[PDB]
Structure formats: structure tokens, C-alpha cells
Amino acid sequence: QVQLQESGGGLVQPGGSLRLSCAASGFTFSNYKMNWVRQAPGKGLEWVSDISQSGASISYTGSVKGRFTISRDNAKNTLYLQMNSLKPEDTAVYYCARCPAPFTRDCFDVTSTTYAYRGQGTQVTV
Amino acid sequence: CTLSAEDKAAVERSKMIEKQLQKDKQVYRATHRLLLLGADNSGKSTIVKQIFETKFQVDKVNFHMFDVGGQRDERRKWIQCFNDVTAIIFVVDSSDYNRLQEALNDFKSIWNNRWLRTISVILFLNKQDLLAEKVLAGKSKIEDYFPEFARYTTPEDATPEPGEDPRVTRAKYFIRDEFLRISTASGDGRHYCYPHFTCAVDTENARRIFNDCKDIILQMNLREYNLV
């Protein structure tokens, strides 16, 4: 069964740092592109970052450019997100999303309301 | 012919069915089909003044446009139905900076989709008047959402419409360049993007679609004969 578990969230003062982790199971982790998404109160899902299979290709959204960084350990089958200089608007529930099909670059339906290959998320408050 | 009389009559019936199919073949192959995409608040409903389907006519050429809206949020599966269409018409609201990154991500997803790797995209950057008013007002700043705007300069080939402000032109061409740089990374010459600036009062959209479809057909024919 496809399982994604997020961890590493809480309340941190503005200007601090926080490390999010996502443990994946039930599939070949090295075969899929991965994404980090967030949902803020009173707002819908918003794509944040993504990393490809080999990790060569890394992309961010505008607000997190430079402040955050994404990485993945395929040997450990885990995804990491480092969060630095946390602005007060970074408060949200964070999800680690998996792209629906392997060996592909397009990733449809990662910011959808009901996506199967997502997780429970971690609350980050600034 | 080693056939019975009823077998021969069945053959004749099949022949008549084939004739009708050939007539339908001519009719079907005459008409161009377009797929209309773009989120809400973009105004994709009113782009042609001529809602699941729409017919319109431009100089003895028939266009048939489809807007799929009666489905769920996920579009991973049914989108495959539209891989024979001549063009995807993507409408983007050009005044809202809060949801423009979502439009960029959607355009990226459409552009790099496996079953949409040969379909060209006509890009309509709608609501130019609102963008111009917001830029001249100064309340909103593109730099807040796009830091790259500071280290940006207007294109050399950029055209100013008669009477305008350089800041408005800079904003417009930055918005266009975002989609263009998305579009010029995996196209490989198989499909292209045609961006346009259109307001709500604009009535030239159908002609732009006609010209873009002409170009799409020419490129497809060149590639099929293996000349490009």
C-alpha cells in the first residue's frame, strides 16, 4: 500500500528554521518525482517545491526561493525539506505528494482536494 | 462469387454504410476542433462573441470549441480524450498576481503531458486593462511575488501600443516571458505556443485563432512529409 508519512512540524518563532521529513513505503521511491505542497487556513492547496528522480532537477515556488531547500535520499527512501527564515505566512499544513506515474515529468493533480498519493501533513506555525 | 443472395445484399448494405461514412469523413476532416482551458476568474467563457460546446465560423472555416466543466477537480484521465485537437486555447488572467503561479504550473503540466506532446497552445493573456490600471495605481507590486522582475528589462522586439507607459509594457512582457520560457524548454520543434494580449472588448480573437491554426496545420504537414 502506498504510504507517505510526514514529520517534523510545530511552532517556531519567526526567523527560525525547521526540517520536514517524509517517509515513503509501498512503492519504488527512486522511480517517482516528488513534491511538497502546503495548505494555509482559509486558502486552498499551493504547490511549493518539487524534485525529480535522480535529484538533478529541483524547482521551487517564488515565495520559498532561496529560503527553502528540497532533497531526497533514495537509499533511505525519504524526502527532506529544510525551511529557513520563516516568514509569518509560512504557517500551513504541509503535504509530501507523489506523482501519479513513474518515468514521467508531468505531474497532474497534486494540488487537488482528494489526491490518493498524498499524506496527512504536518502543521507549521510561525 | 460463392455467395448467397442474402450475403450479396448484406454486402450491398455494408457498401452503402461505407458511402455514408465517407461523407461523414469529409465533413469531420473539414472542421477544426479546439480545447478551451484556463481556471476561473480568467474569463475564458467570453473570448469569442459568436457551454460544453460552441460553434463558430471564420471565412468559410468551421471551428468547434469544447469547455469541459462538468467533471471533478482531477483531470489526469479524461484529458487524454483531447489528443487529436488542433489547438489548446489557454486563458490566463493577467491582473491577479496572487494566482498567477498556479496558472504557470497548470500551463507547465499541460505543456509537458505525454499525450499532449504534439498539440500546440494558443495563449490568451486576458484582462489587460485591469493589469494596466493596477500597474499605474502602484498598490500591487510584481516584485513581491516575482523577485526576478527587478532584474528584468523590456524586450528589444517588444511593441508598444500607441499611447502607453513603459512600466505597463514591462509588466505585460514579463508575464508573457514566464509562459514563453516554460514553453521553450521541451518543445523540440514538435509543438509551439502563440501568445496574445487580449482585453474583454477585443473582438479579433477569432482571427488570431484562425491564423494560428493555419500555422499549426502548415507545420504538421511539413513534419508529416518529413521536410522539417
Added chain:
Amino acid sequence: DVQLVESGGGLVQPGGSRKLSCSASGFAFSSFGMHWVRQAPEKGLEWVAYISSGSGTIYYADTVKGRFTISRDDPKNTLFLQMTSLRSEDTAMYYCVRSIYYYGSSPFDFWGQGTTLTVSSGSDIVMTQATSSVPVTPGESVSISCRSSKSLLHSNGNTYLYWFLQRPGQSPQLLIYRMSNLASGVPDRFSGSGSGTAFTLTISRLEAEDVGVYYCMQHLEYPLTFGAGTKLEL
């Protein structure tokens, strides 16, 4: 519903001309092939001509070639039989028949009412019905036998035999098609059997509505040939 009403009959002098019309309604006339079948006074049924859907194929009987011609007007749902050089032998009642041909269909299913025309004073399969009359009481079971000059079993595996019933003062109605199938709306009590050249029609629990004249026909090759007719008088 389905109607195939025919007009154009009357009395004519010999060596003359006459046009018979068949106006149809309630069904797709364009997709159906059409036949003309004439019944001589107190004789059996005789095939006249066949026009196909789309008018691509036309067949005539040898007795009416050159003098008769068939045509159709699909927009107006009308069939025409133009006739010249009329003879005393043409005096008959002319039924207008519809027939559709595709895998698993029932040709000759619906017959028109007919029209009465009066005239003032070799490689053809032969169908033979043994009995011309059969006495029988209601509630019993009766069998009608039809023999063919040539084997009707084709290489595709279809034995082209058709069984029709003509109740008194009525047009014929299809009972059996291709020697086994039971036509739509026909009671289950009728059954068909046969082998190549000999065929039998069995009618269990005979009732009042079942009394009439039974005809066996072959659709293997043109021209189409009817039997002599068996009259199940009560």
C-alpha cells in the same frame, strides 16, 4: 405503425399500360428492399420483381421482363410498378412486400394489403407441397411437407426456406424464416424442421386462428419460387 397500402388496380384492356403504387409509412422505407408478388385468382403466389435499397440491384421474373419495370422514390416513400403490354395472364392481386438483409434478420416479414388488376378476355428451383388439403380438428397436431428440387443448404450453413400463412381474405404472414427461426409475434406452437431437400412444419395445439393456406418458399437464388399451397380446412 407499419403500413404498405397499395393502389392502382382496375380493369384494363389487353396490350395496355398501368401503374401500381405502394405507399409506405411507419418504418424506414429507404433501408428496406421491396418485392412485388402477385397471386392469381384461386392459384398460388408468384414473384414479380425486386428493387434493392438504394436501387443498386433490380431483378425481374422471366414472365414479366421487358414489359414491367420497378422503381422507388425514397424521399416520398413510394414504390412503383409500371406495366406495359398487359395480357390475360397478368390478372392477379399484387402484394407489396418489404425485406431487409443483414446477418440475423427476417426478410419478407410484412406484406401489404394488395390490389386487384383485371384484364379483359430451366435452372429454376421447383417447390413441391405434397398435400393440397388437410382435414384436422382443433387441439391436434398437424404437419406440412415441402420438397425442394435442389438442396437449399448453402455452404455458409443456412437453409433458405420460408413458411408463410394466408388466412382467408387476408394477406400472407411470415411464420418461419430459414427453416428454423420463428418470426416475431408468431405463436410458439409453430415449429420448423428439415434436411436439405425435405422440410416439415409442425403445428401443435391447433386453434381456430391457424386455419388457412400454408406456403413454402426458397430464397437461395433468383428468381424466388413458392410452393403449391396446403389448405388446412377445418
Added chain:
Amino acid sequence: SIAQARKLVEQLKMEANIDRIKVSKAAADLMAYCEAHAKEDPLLTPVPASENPFRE
């Protein structure tokens, strides 16, 4: 929400009540079926052309 989780738990409990059988017996049954019907499979045993309806 609350209802979705409650229905998920109820469905899991309902699925928990079924009695499972060993894989060996099931595999043996499938193998036995395939062995038994190994003669009525034209795609597994090619049929003479005269019998094939698509021979042409």
C-alpha cells in the same frame, strides 16, 4: 472527516471477519482448472484450419 474515518474503520472491521484459506490450496485449484480445460482452449492448442472460422 469524522464520518469518513468512521466508515473506513467499519469497513476494515467488516473485512476482518472473512475466513482466509491457505495459498497452496488456491494455487492448486487454479492449476487444476487450467489442466482440466487445457483441451478446450484454441488459443492454447491451435485448431485445424478447416475448423477455424477465421481461416480464410
Added chain:
Amino acid sequence: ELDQLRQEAEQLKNQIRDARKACADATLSQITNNIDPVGRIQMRTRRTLRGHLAKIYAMHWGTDSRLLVSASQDGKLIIWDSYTTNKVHAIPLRSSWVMTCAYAPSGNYVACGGLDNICSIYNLKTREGNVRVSRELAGHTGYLSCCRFLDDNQIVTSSGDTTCALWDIETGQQTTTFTGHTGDVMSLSLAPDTRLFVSGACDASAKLWDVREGMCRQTFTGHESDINAICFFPNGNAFATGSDDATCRLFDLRADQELMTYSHDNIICGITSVSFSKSGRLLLAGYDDFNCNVWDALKADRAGVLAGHDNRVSCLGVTDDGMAVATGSWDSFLKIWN
């Protein structure tokens, strides 16, 4: 109290998985390790059915094993006579975007549906002599992805709104609604006894349903991506699924778990369609690489390839007498292999 429900669900899943592992004494590979290979399974194209204008999504065989129905995005269904390569009926549709079609076991009706969220039933046999729409079933909130007849007055449908339904055609109403999938339901397969049926959805999940009561008996997992096709083994105690994982899997109802996997390192494209032979010894699956693969179900060894199309193999079917295989592709062609 949401965490309590979540931990209850996790504990139940752990109980289920350990109870399942308590039955895996041996694998089908070891049980069928001493079976002679079927050998080189070579098939040839006997008929090629031409006449559609656009990509073909669905096809369905008749019970007589001679007539079949196919559906194209040009807006047409066609009933083909396979033996003679003849067109018996050409039915224009009111909606061009059709994704499925079914043929009634009696042979008096056909069904279709698609992006219009409607299931249309057409009566093939009418006194007027032309096919006309018999019924227009409405009620789904998403595209109709599959439909299968039970008899002349019952049909089961799956839709993109993550649900299935059982209808009464005379009243045009849903007699039953099956819910539980958290993603678009792609394909369904009726049991030979028409008592149970499975549905596979875009959540790596298959579900077994009882039509009479309307509840999910069992849920099968093991795929990593969306299931695109599903089909029962002939005796009804197992079924096979194909997915975007580029693997097919065999699940047994009695053991409540999968028994065999079918994949190769070269294959990286997903399975669009899957079907079994008459005896269940061969598993036929069409892919996005424009080819169909034949698998030795009992040994998970590839035995042959059907390679005649030049685009995606969208639909696949096997006759009820197991005499031919029909494959329809996006290149607007349908082929018969024997």
C-alpha cells in the same frame, strides 16, 4: 477524536496484514515450478476491421462470438460481422466523447457513455428497422468509464465521480449505488454467475462488491499507481489487474491476496487492457508501446507478442468460445488475431 479513529484504522490494517501473512505458506511460482511451458504462442492477424474515423476506445464481443461493437470519438458505434468483415449497424451518437460500450448478452441492446455522464441504451431490434435510443440513464456526477449488462433490464456502471451503480432500465433509476473508492473508477468485471463484480480505481485499489446487497466484501491493494483494466479468471475465484505500474497482478478471492506478478525490465509503459483465455492459462495485455503481450499466467513467463498496431492499444477482448482475440487501437483500427 480523529486520531483515535486513525489509530483504530491502522490497528485494523495491521491485523489484516498479519492475518493475510498467516496464510502465505507457499507461492504460485513454487506450486507451478514443475509445469511444462506452453511454448511459443504465435498468433496472426486474420481480419482487419476498417471504417472508424478516430481513435477507438471500447469494444465488446457478442455471445454468438461473431458480432462485435466498437466505439470511436468521431461519434459512432459500429457493429461488425467478424466472419465476413461486414458493417451491420452504424449508430451515430449525440456526444462525440465516448469512452465505453457494451453488448447485451441477449443481443437486443447496446450501451454507451462518456464525458457526458449519461449511459445511453440503444434498441437494436425495432419494427421500423433502424436503431433508436431506448433509454438515457442520468445520475452520475462524472464521466462514465465502463458499463456492463446483466440482463435486458439491468446494467452496472462505473464513473469518474468515484462510484459505481446498478440501474433499472425501465424506470431509468439507480437501484443501487456502490461507494468506497477514493479515485476514478476505470474498469469493472462481472462474475460468470453475475453475483459479484470487482472495480479498480485510480488509487491502487480494487474492490469486490455484491450486487444484491451493495457492500464491499473485500479490498485488494498491491499496485503502485492507477488501475486501468480488470478481469476475472474463468472459474470466478481469481482476477487480474493492470495498471500504470507496468505490471499485471493476479488476486485470489479466497486467499484475499495476490498470487503472481507479470512484468519485465524493458517494459516501462502502463497496461491499458487485460483479458484471459478460455481456460485461463494465457493472460493477454495491451500496452502503450503499441503491442500486446501474452503471459503464461501460471509461470509469469512471456510467451508471445501481438505487434500490428501503430498507436496505443486501447481495447482488447476474447470471444466466449476462445477462438479469436480482438484488439482495437488509437490508430482507428481493430484487428482479429488467431
